[PDB]
Ligand binder design. Structure first.
Ligand SMILES: [Mg+2]
Ligand SMILES: [Mg+2]
Ligand SMILES: [Mg+2]
Ligand SMILES: [Mg+2]
Ligand SMILES: [Mg+2]
Ligand SMILES: [Mg+2]
Ligand SMILES: [Mg+2]
Ligand SMILES: [Mg+2]
Ligand SMILES: [Mg+2]
Ligand SMILES: [Mg+2]
Ligand SMILES: [Mg+2]
Lengths: 101, 247, 140, 75, 72
RNA sequence: GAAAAGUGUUUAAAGGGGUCCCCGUCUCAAAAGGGAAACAGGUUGAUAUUCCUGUGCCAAUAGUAUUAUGAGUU
RNA sequence: UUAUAACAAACCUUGGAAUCAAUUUACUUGGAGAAGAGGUUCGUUGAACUCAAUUCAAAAAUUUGUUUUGUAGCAAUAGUAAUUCGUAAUUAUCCGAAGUGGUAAGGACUAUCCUUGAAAAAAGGAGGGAACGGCUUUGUGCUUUGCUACUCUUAAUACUUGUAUG
RNA sequence: UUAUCCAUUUAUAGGGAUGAAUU
């Protein structure tokens, strides 16, 4: 069991680890994403390469009035994660789209 | 010149044994208090092929005297052993085919196999299919025993040294001709890559003492000294005589 | 003679009671449309008294030596009869009743049998070899 | 209690090479670490060899009581 | 997907509160056959009735908080 | 072995399982060997056993307390 | 565990086999128990079979007869081919026999080998009999005293514990 | 024999007279 008289390294700086702002970067337009928004209430977000599904969900919860049933993700060949977020039935992605912009 | 085929073998690369399918090493029991002072009986639970060998194995199960559990040995099967036979091992064992006894306790003439040359060696001599040794005498001093190995050689061993009464299974396997090259192929395919043997005399000089010539002939005496080096030791090594054996 | 006389102890060889030792109570040997085989009717022990030390306390010993019994009609070809006979140490007619094999409260009967067995084990007598044999679980 | 058959054990067990044996201490057989084993062996070696007189004279070490008395005096 | 044959069992299932939806289907037989499906959290239980009136009666019987889906 | 490297239990005080005993080198090596579980239909300009509708399946699911579900024992 | 059916095996009971018998394309098998008679199981398969339901009528403490359904559920709501009607909706169809033996898989076997044809994670089963109710009170986890809902078991629900589903 | 060397095993009882076997 450790009992160091002082800790070795103490990062006093504000955390570098990615917050909501930084994790999730921006929604996608593109005809595909628009279609998704219209038809099956799935919002498409470009996110950081090092976002997990859990993390993305958390971000979405924090950044917007969104509850997400399921999140699929993929790594784009442009070095971004694209997260397809299916909203719970209580919410209309269209309305939330409008709210965001 | 080049490195001869023989020399290549020692580096063991492709010339290692084909060890993969083998069932394990064939060994007698560890030399416990039981086997030294009395007898232990085990069941031959199954008799099995061990690939690269010519002699079938017997998986014999013993009960461990110092912890509750069954443990398996791999014995070489003497002819006449069978599944569900009891095999007994120890100083005070009875003299039956299959059983494992110190050579001191077998009268002359008895036929044995899996013989330890030193006590505890887990059995080392007379293992090949068909082979057996003979107890030829025990000295009035006790202690040592005289045995005659399949070669013909007579050797003196400790009487405490263990052995297995009977002859090794799969006898006469050499009686049947291999006939086909392929059957030899299959034989060595399970042992190690020693087959085809190209003749030194069919090689070039870089490759072999015998290599080259406009004729295919060895060209120099093919009896080589004991005290030759690696690439010289090639024909009849250290040959005391040569030619059709008359004796 | 007639190997299986009422009271003889047998080893069941077949079924759920596979290696259990038991007392035959009434042999029939009459083949019928119902049971086309000579059958024996047997009262036996499923779960023997566990091993017990002098050191142990009396209640705990009693608990340990509970003996869980069973009553089963069985083909005589499935039972290995023994030399051991317990016509004496039990009133044998009292163990199993033919009629009660059919009856609803069979479990009650079984319980009673078990209790009787336990009692017998507690008071051995002088000490019969048969009873000793019955006591010991068969190890196979 | 005192019943013949409730407490009857089949304890007549031990014949050679049949059934697990009873038990022994095993101290004689335990492997021990390399160091400590060497010390043990070293001691034995020392005992065993012909020890030169001077060295030997370093292990005739008084009688115990007398030594204790001496120590007390020194105190 | 499971089939049910004991009407009583079906009723019991219906009574149980994880049964959110009923699906009631009408099928021209080779008369009007009726398939009663209950959508439980675990399984989709279905009962087939040859007899329309009986089917109707059982539908009526079904708790009025069920989320009834009339397919065709 | 000057090291670089070469060998891998050869003379080790080499992490797990139970309530001190009992096991026991580590690690990588298979996108054709071993192996928890998925199907159908629909949908896009470009993806689909991966999205949609439907229908399942597998593995988890900490404690404490209620509920119900059935067993067993009195 | 798809329910059942049918089938190659394996086993059980009964039965007691030479005038040998059963039996395969092949040989295999039998007093260490064959044939015959009745069963059990695994495996194929995955709705076969009256399979399930219902129709009513008769017999016991529930089984037989007749009929109508169900593409067994999934499942027709989906597909396909049609037919219209509108500027997406309706309808009608989807079902009775069988052969060939190309491919795959399984089965039971038989044969060859101086060739006998990986391992482990993981899982399971067995053997064994360690340990053993709960609550309340007293004394130093253990013992004594008194009362009867208990020990499991899934599922849901609630609440603290880092946010207890992928 | 104690150096050294080899073997054997879990370093498992000091020397002699086709079931089970563990708390
Ligand atoms: Mg992915
Ligand atoms: Mg040759
Ligand atoms: Mg040649
Ligand atoms: Mg040439
Ligand atoms: Mg040369
Ligand atoms: Mg030439
Ligand atoms: Mg020539
Ligand atoms: Mg790996
Ligand atoms: Mg694979
Ligand atoms: Mg494409
Ligand atoms: Mg249609």
């Amino acid at each position: 069991a450790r009992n160091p008289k002082c800790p070795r390294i103490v990062k006093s700086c504000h955390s570098k680890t990615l917050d909501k702002y930084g994790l999730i970067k921006y929604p996608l337009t593109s005809e595909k994403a628009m279609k998704k928004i219209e038809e099956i209430n799935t919002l498409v977000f470009m996110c950081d390469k090092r976002a997990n599904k859990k993390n993305i969900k958390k971000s979405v919860k924090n950044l917007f009035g969104i509850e997400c049933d399921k999140v699929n993700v993929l790594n784009t060949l442009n070095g971004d994660k694209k997260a397809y977020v299916r909203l719970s039935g209580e919410h209309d992605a269209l309305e939330v789209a409008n709210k965001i912009g | 010149g080049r490195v001869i085929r023989g020399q290549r073998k020692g580096r063991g690369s492709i010339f290692k044994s084909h060890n993969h399918h083998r069932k394990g090493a064939a060994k007698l029991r560890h030399l416990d208090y039981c086997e030294k002072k009395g007898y232990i009986k085990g069941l031959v639970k199954d008799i099995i092929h061990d690939p690269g060998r010519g002699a079938p194995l017997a998986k014999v199960i013993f009960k461990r005297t110092e912890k509750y559990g069954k443990k398996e040995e791999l014995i070489i099967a003497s002819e006449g052993m069978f599944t569900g036979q009891y095999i007994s091992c120890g100083t005070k064992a009875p003299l039956s085919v299959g059983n494992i006894l110190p050579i001191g306790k077998m009268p002359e003439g008895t036929l044995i196999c899996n013989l330890e040359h030193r006590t505890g060696n887990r059995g080392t001599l007379v293992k090949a299919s068909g082979c057996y040794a003979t107890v030829v005498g025990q000295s009035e001093d006790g202690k040592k025993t005289k045995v005659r190995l399949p070669s013909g050689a007579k050797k003196t061993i400790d009487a405490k040294a263990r052995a297995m009464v009977g002859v090794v299974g799969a006898g006469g396997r050499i009686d049947k001709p291999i006939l086909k090259a392929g059957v030899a192929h299959h034989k060595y395919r399970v042992k190690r890559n020693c087959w085809p043997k190209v003749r030194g005399v069919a090689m070039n000089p870089v490759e072999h003492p015998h290599g080259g010539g406009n004729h295919q002939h060895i060209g120099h005496p093919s009896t080589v000294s004991r005290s030759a080096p690696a690439g010289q030791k090639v024909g009849l090594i250290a040959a005391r005589r040569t030619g059709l054996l008359r004796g | 003679g007639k190997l299986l006389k009422p009271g003889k102890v047998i080893i069941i060889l077949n079924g759920r009671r596979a290696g259990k030792k038991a007392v035959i109570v009434n042999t029939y040997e009459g083949q019928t449309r119902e049971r086309p085989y000579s059958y024996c009717l047997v009262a036996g022990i499923e779960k023997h008294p566990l091993k017990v030390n002098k050191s142990m306390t009396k209640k705990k010993i009693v608990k340990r030596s509970k003996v869980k019994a069973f009553i089963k009609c069985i083909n005589v070809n499935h039972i290995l009869p023994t030399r051991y006979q317990v016509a004496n140490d039990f009133d044998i007619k009292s163990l199993a009743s033919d009629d009660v094999l059919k009856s609803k409260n069979k479990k009650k009967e079984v319980k009673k049998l078990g209790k009787i067995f336990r009692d017998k084990f507690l008071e051995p007598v002088e000490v019969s070899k048969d009873i000793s044999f019955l006591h010991k679980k068969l190890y196979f | 209690k005192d019943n013949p058959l409730i407490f009857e054990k089949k304890k007549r067990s031990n014949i050679i090479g049949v059934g697990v044996r009873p038990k022994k201490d095993l101290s004689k057989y335990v492997k021990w670490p390399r160091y400590i084993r060497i010390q043990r062996k070293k001691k034995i070696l020392l005992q065993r060899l012909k020890v030169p007189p001077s060295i030997n004279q370093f292990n005739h070490t008084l009688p115990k009581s007398q030594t204790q008395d001496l120590l007390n005096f020194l105190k | 997907p499971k089939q049910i044959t004991d009407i009583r069992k079906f009723l019991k299932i219906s009574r149980k509160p994880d049964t959110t939806a009923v699906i009631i289907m009408k099928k021209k037989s080779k008369t009007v056959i009726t398939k009663l499906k209950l959508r439980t959290k675990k399984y989709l239980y279905t009962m087939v009735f040859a007899d329309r009136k009986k089917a109707e009666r059982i539908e009526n019987s079904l708790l009025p908080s069920l989320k009834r889906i009339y397919y065709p």
